[PDB]
Amino acid sequence: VETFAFQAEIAQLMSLIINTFYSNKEIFLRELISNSSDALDKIRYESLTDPSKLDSGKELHINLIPNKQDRTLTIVDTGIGMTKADLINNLGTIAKSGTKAFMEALQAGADISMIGQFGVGFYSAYLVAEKVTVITKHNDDEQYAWESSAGGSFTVRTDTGEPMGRGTKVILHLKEDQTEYLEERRIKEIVKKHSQFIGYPITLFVE
């Protein structure tokens, strides 16, 4: 298991998300679903010129999986996935995100719901999650598990468990007071409100 420090600005961003008083937390789901949709777009595009890239799975969709026993909400896609390098770069650094613009915008009257405009929607997971675990598989690499409870660090390890073919699974270990997002009616409401036009099937698992 390898432990890494977030780039300073990413740590600052996560701290702002965790510590700012902001009640409209439901937008995290929209942001993760949009990330999944973008990843599905990418594998769809790549497979046009190389259909063998779908050998790891033809189906392009998004699964939402609540588990009240474990207090987790899991968002799974069969999108492009991330290599180890992709994981560390995209989740651990500013990379090509608008991290800087976002934090300046918040100081200038923007609100946290606008996080998606700045390519850092992933971090909105920390509105509702005390820990986030990300399992991912890209065609060009092995399966990896990334994990962080914030506090300035994250871990990465090779994941030799059940192979997932291709895609990304985001596991939200919910804060104690955020269990509403495990409720079928609440999830349906949020999907209908914010993600009704997503171009891929979104299946809400039942328990």
Ligand SMILES: Cc1nc(N)nc2c1C(=O)C[C@@H](c1ccccc1)C2
């Ligand atoms: C391939 C993929 N699939 C999913 N489901 N989600 C993501 C990705 C990425 O590649 C980027 C990653 C990210 C995280 C943090 C900041 C910016 C981008 C989010």
